[model samples]
Target: PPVHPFVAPLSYLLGTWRGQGEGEYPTIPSFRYGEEIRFSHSGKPVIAYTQKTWKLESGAPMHAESGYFRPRPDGSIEVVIAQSTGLVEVQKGTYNVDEQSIKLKSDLVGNASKVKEISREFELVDGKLSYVVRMSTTTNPLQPHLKAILDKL
Candidate 1:
């Protein structure tokens, strides 16, 4: 398949990123983690993403997720993500290549018993990709749950 020209606004994201992040919630003590996220395109209309995290101290595997990012004609993005945590989110938002950023919020959510709906904002900032996640779960009200800065590798 040939790459769709419509992907231009998000084409810059087609690469791997590694970083460190902090996690927090009302029900759990704050902790730091090592994170990696990758985005790739297969000459298709959508961009694919995969993310993983490990405990900062023990180096134990913590979480993993994968998703597809689709851009609509009006410059908005539609992201569908599934997580090892048993949560799935359908989000819609915007992507701006000029600033190298993606801002998305859940439009529909499907959560396992203990999971929550989440939103994310990502920016290529100061030569790094920085992002933050906010969520509302059974254990915690809507609040910022994660913040991280990732380096290109």
Candidate 2:
């Protein structure tokens, strides 16, 4: 089946991606993790999103997140995500079809989360998917938290 028209602009993400990412926060030690992300759809206007991460050295499970991406006709996108650590995020974003890039900023964070805001950016270049995440906490300003480069499988 063909990709739904409403989500065609996001078709670039419609596959499984695997790679390694570095993570860090002011409150924790820096570390490397293996990551996988999947995007799928069933003739719908929205894209299903899922992600999992494990320790790079030991392959022990670490974290998981799931979400949906809704792309509208006006180049705007909505993302709603829930984390394994009991956090949720609602984001609004924009995508550029020509550039194969997306930018998102959180509109609201979950209950009792130390995180105040988050910004995310994803770009597809040379068939590689790369993304960076920045987050703000109750006591800190927005800072780099994670970044990864992945290849579609």
Candidate 3:
């Protein structure tokens, strides 16, 4: 299958990523969590993404989602994502590209709810790729929301 030019550039993420990180729950206790994320391109116009997170302290599944990412004509990327437990979010953001990194910023709306901005950055270092997600919502300032580190499989 011939790959889309835009898709090929992002192909470095086509595999599984596993990592651990700690997060604080405002007024609540801080906990350690682990996450696994899979990224793949099907030679179609969009990339497929899926992720699952687990609480390390309790061995409980935290969240999961399936999504498709497509690049737009206006130099932005559109993400259509659906949660496993029945929520949907659509985000549109622009990308800042360089030789080894891409950054995306989008306004996200979940289930017809209020909108927020989400920003993500992907960088390649020493043959490994890492991603960081930051978000700004109605009640909170922009902060690190999630992160992933991956290698080609």
Candidate with top TM-score is 2
Query: What's the distance in Å from true for residue 99, model 2?
Result: 1.0
Q: What's the C-alpha lDDT at position 87 in model 1?
A: 76
> Which clashing pairs does model 1 show?
none
CA-lDDT, candidates in order: 0.86, 0.92, 0.69
Q: What does candidate 2's lDDT look like per residue over 74-125, in tens digits? A: 9899999989989899999999999999999999988745789999899998
What's the C-alpha lDDT at position 112 in model 1?
71
Top lDDT prediction, candidate number: 2
**lDDT value, residue 120 of candidate 1:** 87
Q: What digit string (tens of lDDT, one per residue) describes model 3 on residues 49-85?
A: 8888788777799888888888744567777788876
Summing lDDT over every window of 10 consecutive residues in candidate 1, give the lowest-scoring window. 108-117
lDDT of prediction 1: 0.86
Please say which candidate is ahead in TM-score: 2 or 3: 2
The TM-score, computed over Cα atoms with residue i paired to residue i, of candidate 1 is 0.90
| TM-scores of all predicted structures | 0.90, 0.96, 0.75
Which clashing pairs does model 3 show? Answer: none
